[PDB]
């Protein structure tokens, strides 16, 4: 648990659902299978610098 250690090992939002931690992402994203990362569901995802 503890989203304090290192953001709970999430790429984004973190929560401490009663016992352990749960990860989630911004709109336009999707939680990877490891429930920790965040994957863009489109070509111009929020937060990212065009390049």
């Amino acid at each position: 648990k503890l989203c304090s250690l290192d953001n709970g090992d999430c790429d984004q939002f973190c929560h401490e659902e009663q016992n352990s931690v749960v990860c989630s992402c911004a709109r336009g994203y999707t939680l990877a299978d490891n429930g920790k990362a965040c994957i863009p569901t489109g070509p111009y995802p929020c937060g990212k610098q065009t390049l």
Binding site: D11, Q12, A26, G47, K48, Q49, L51
Partner: protein, 235 residues
């Protein structure tokens, strides 16, 4: 902007600029989605009619990726107060979708609790615009971005000459000649976290520009989240 670097190709793609009849920039904005721009609510008085220009980094040498949109409807925060800049926040609705491309993309919106714990306790934050480069200078042809570190809330309060309401927060420097300025109001204040930037604040106000012992006061987006949501459904 005073100091800071220059927004390089693709660095500040969420910046937006509100232009007047004369086609002059007079305030910033922050693309949230294809249809909504996030900006400071006082800026909604420096123009009888305006348009939001996005994807523009240098006013003069047509980068090509520019684009101008006419506001469909403007949603100003009911509790704004010219007398104290409290609730200095608004959200514009474009009539035509913003097409995302290089130097044109929307910045993310965080989660209240998460952002206040991890996004604001950070060491610094980004703020950009086309505003003056010196406290009493001209605007700016090149789009700029400054790294303003977070300021203690009490030094914040003590340094000011005006009240710092719940919907506000300090950022910048006591002595370093670096800070937003005229024409940067409404501009985005984003925080980077793992190569991803979140809209953690709206350029609101300041007592001069880069004045010693004075800071730059921004709008506390996290304090308005639910509102932004309830606004991106238009209200």
């Amino acid at each position: 902007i005073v100091g800071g670097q220059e927004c390089k190709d693709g660095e500040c793609p969420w910046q937006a600029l509100l232009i007047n009849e004369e086609n002059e920039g007079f305030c910033g904005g922050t693309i949230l989605s294809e249809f909504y721009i996030l900006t400071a609510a006082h800026c909604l008085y420096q123009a009888k009619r305006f348009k939001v220009r996005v994807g523009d980094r240098n006013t003069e040498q047509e980068e090509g990726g520019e684009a101008v949109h006419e506001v469909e409807v403007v949603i100003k925060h009911n509790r704004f107060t010219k007398e104290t800049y409290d609730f200095d926040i608004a959200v514009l609705r474009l009539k035509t979708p913003i097409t995302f491309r290089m130097n044109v993309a929307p910045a993310c919106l965080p989660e209240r609790d998460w952002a206040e714990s991890t996004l604001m306790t950070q060491k610094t934050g980004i703020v950009s615009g086309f505003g003056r480069t010196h406290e009493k200078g001209r605007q700016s042809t090149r789009l700029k971005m400054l790294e303003v570190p977070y300021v203690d809330r009490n030094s914040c309060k003590l340094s000011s000459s005006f009240i710092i309401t719940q919907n506000m927060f300090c950022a910048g420097y006591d002595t370093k000649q670096e800070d937003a300025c005229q024409g940067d109001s409404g501009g985005p204040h984003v925080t980077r976290f793992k190569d991803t930037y979140f809209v953690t604040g709206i350029v609101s106000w300041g007592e001069g520009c880069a004045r010693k012992g004075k800071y730059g006061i921004y709008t506390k987006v996290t304090a308005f989240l639910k509102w932004i949501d309830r606004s991106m459904k238009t209200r």
